[PDB]
Each structure stands twice: as structure tokens, then as C-alpha cells.
Design a protein around this ligand. Structure first.
Ligand SMILES: O=C(O)CNC(=O)C(=O)O
Ligand SMILES: [Mg+2]
Ligand code: NI
Ligand SMILES: [Zn+2]
Length: 331
């Protein structure tokens, strides 16, 4: 069995190996990369996402989100307070201001320590979930806006055409901006490209151990768990590495830098934080191996999670017994 300890693997495809996305995902899996829940992919040196990042300041962040924490330093929830619109140029200035800028630090480990000690005492502002792309149209390899759609994958595997579209999203971050513990909608894959700026630290639980994380989360967030049997779908809970280690939860950590891709695998729980001003682009995708995970994915039916349009068809076709309850939660 490849990668039996579920370590995060790092890949260096050549330019020839970068031509066929599906084939390279399957190759990574042949080496056991999915067992970690997360892999890093460093593009060939011949490749670029676009020419420059000099022309992005006029992009609008219509609804910046202030991430306000409740709890204790290692075990907290965050809610998102909506703020007034601002451009990427305005947000970058904000991120670099004394109130929000990254503190002095020695190395990624020192910064990690400072994050976990101090995050709850501040409320950073995140430009998350902005529909759009920064890949140039003439980038032909690993262009996140030109991947095969999940609706086409389901159709090719199962035979049924479905409605819906699949497009990328941009994330503009600052120091301490946080992504809570989650798997993807319908336990899909995701791919995430860090276009520019400061790093992004990731934590991940192997898919084969995901239920251990869920059981700890129920223990640590007992009111949230009573409210919803899939409350991690709400994407609000944070648990630190120290608390995970105290509770024997298998996990790994890695830091992504500008110019690097990360792939999350079906049912790989992940969480993390940004080091400073940065911009990432992400999208979900599927392969034939995903179908069996989509049929078994949990769902939030309590009202909170409120998802995209395009999940309807995936629940309807893959999970017909759950569909009527799920849709009641959507309304
Ligand atoms: O960078 C972010 O805010 C979120 N990271 C991820 O959830 C991902 O690409 O799967
Ligand atoms: Mg612009
Ligand atoms: Ni994700
Ligand atoms: Zn719920």
C-alpha cells in the first residue's frame, strides 16, 4: 500500500507531465498522495499563470468579511461580519497597515506559534469567495477556469446530463485570516493556486481518519453539534494542532507559497491561515474515484450551511433518499 503513514507528498511535474491534468492526478494517487488528504504541486519552471500581477488593484471585493472569534485560543468558532466594499488596492493597503500587518517573526514555525496564541484577540478582514479568475486565457496547462466540469464528470460516469456550472473563486487574504475545518461540498476534490503574496499554512486529516476529527469536534463544540449532525459543513470551527495532538488525532501540516498548487482529496478535512496579504484562486473538481465519496457525503439540513445552486443535482442523483430533507434545509 503506497504512503501508508499518510504523509503530505510534494510533486515536481515536468512540462510534458503538466499537459494532462487528469492523468497527473491519477499518477499522484498511484503513489498514495490521496491518503494524506492534501498534496503540493510545484509547476515546471517553464510555466506561468499570467504575465504579471501589476493590473489587479481595481478588482472589487463587494463584501469583505471580518472574522470574529469566540472561545479559547486553541478551540474557537468564527463568524463573518459583513463590511463595506473595497477594491483590491484598498484591501492591500489595509492588510499592510499597522493594525493588520504581519508581525515580526523568525520563521514559519514562530509565526504559527503567534497565530495560535493570538488569533482570537484580533478580527482580520478576508476577501473570500469572489467569483472570478486570474489565469490568462492563453495559459493552457492547469488553468483553473478550464478544467473539466463536475457536471460533465457525473454525466460521463453515471450517464445522466445535469444542470449547473462550476467556476473558480478568488480569495484575498491578510495576516490571521482563517479557513475553518471542512471538507468540500459533496466531499469533492479542490485545487488551490496561490497567485501572489505571503504564504498560506494548511492542516489536514487523512480521509481514512476523518471520523476521528468529527468525533472530537462534537466533543469540543457541544451546542453546535446538537444543532446539526454535520455542523462542520457550516465552516466555523477551529481546533489547533496542539489540541489535535492532545487528543491523538492524526494530521499533518504544510506551508504553501506563491506559485504553488495544493490539491485536497475527497473527505480530506483541512483548515489553515494566511501569513499576510495574498491572493489565491480555488475550484472544486471531480474524478471517477470521487463518485463513491459523493454518494456517502454528509449533509447539513439545519438551514445554516446554505450552498451553491449546483449542489442540488449532485444530491438529487447521488443521494435520492436524502434529497427531500436536504432541500427543505435549503428553503
Ligand atoms: O484559501 C482558502 O481560504 C481556503 N482553502 C481551501 O479551502 C481549498 O482550496 O480547498
Ligand atoms: Mg484591476
Ligand atoms: Ni477547501
Ligand atoms: Zn447544519
Amino acid at each position: 500500500a503506497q504512503n501508508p503513514n499518510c504523509n503530505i507528498m510534494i510533486f515536481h511535474p515536468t512540462k510534458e507531465e503538466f499537459n494532462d491534468f487528469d492523468k497527473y492526478i491519477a499518477y499522484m494517487e498511484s503513489q498514495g498522495a490521496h491518503r494524506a488528504g492534501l498534496a503540493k504541486i510545484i509547476p515546471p519552471k517553464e510555466w506561468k499563470a499570467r504575465e504579471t500581477y501589476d493590473n489587479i488593484s481595481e478588482i472589487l471585493i463587494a463584501t469583505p468579511l471580518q472574522q470574529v472569534a469566540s472561545g479559547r485560543a486553541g478551540v474557537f468558532t468564527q463568524y463573518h461580519k459583513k463590511k463595506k466594499a473595497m477594491t483590491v488596492g484598498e484591501y492591500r493597503h489595509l492588510a499592510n497597515s499597522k493594525k493588520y500587518q504581519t508581525p515580526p517573526h523568525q520563521n514559519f514555525e514562530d509565526l504559527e506559534r503567534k497565530y495560535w496564541k493570538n488569533r482570537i484577540y484580533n478580527s482580520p478582514i478576508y476577501g473570500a469567495d469572489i467569483s472570478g479568475s486570474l489565469f490568462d486565457e492563453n495559459t493552457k496547462q492547469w488553468n483553473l477556469g478550464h478544467l473539466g466540469t463536475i457536471q460533465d464528470l457525473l454525466e460521463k460516469e453515471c450517464g445522466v446530463v445535469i444542470e449547473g456550472v462550476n467556476t473558480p473563486y478568488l480569495y484575498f487574504g491578510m495576516w490571521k485570516t482563517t479557513f475553518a475545518w471542512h471538507t468540500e461540498d459533496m466531499d469533492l476534490y479542490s485545487i488551490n493556486y496561490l497567485h501572489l503574496g505571503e504564504p498560506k499554512t494548511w492542516y489536514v486529516v487523512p480521509p481514512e481518519h476523518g471520523q476521528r476529527l468529527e468525533r472530537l469536534a462534537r466533543e469540543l463544540f457541544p451546542g453546535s453539534s446538537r444543532g446539526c449532525g454535520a455542523f462542520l459543513r457550516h465552516k466555523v470551527a477551529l481546533i489547533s494542532p496542539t489540541v489535535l495532538k492532545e487528543n491523538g488525532i492524526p494530521f499533518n501540516r504544510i506551508t504553501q507559497e506563491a506559485g504553488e498548487f495544493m490539491v485536497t482529496f475527497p473527505y480530506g478535512y483541512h483548515a489553515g491561515f494566511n501569513h499576510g496579504f495574498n491572493c489565491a484562486e480555488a475550484i472544486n473538481f471531480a474524478t471517477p474515484r470521487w463518485i463513491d465519496y459523493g454518494k456517502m457525503a454528509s449533509q447539513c439540513s439545519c438551514g445554516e450551511a446554505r450552498v451553491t445552486f449546483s449542489m442540488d443535482a449532485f444530491v438529487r442523483i447521488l443521494q435520492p433518499e436524502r434529497y427531500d430533507l436536504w432541500k427543505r434545509g435549503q428553503d
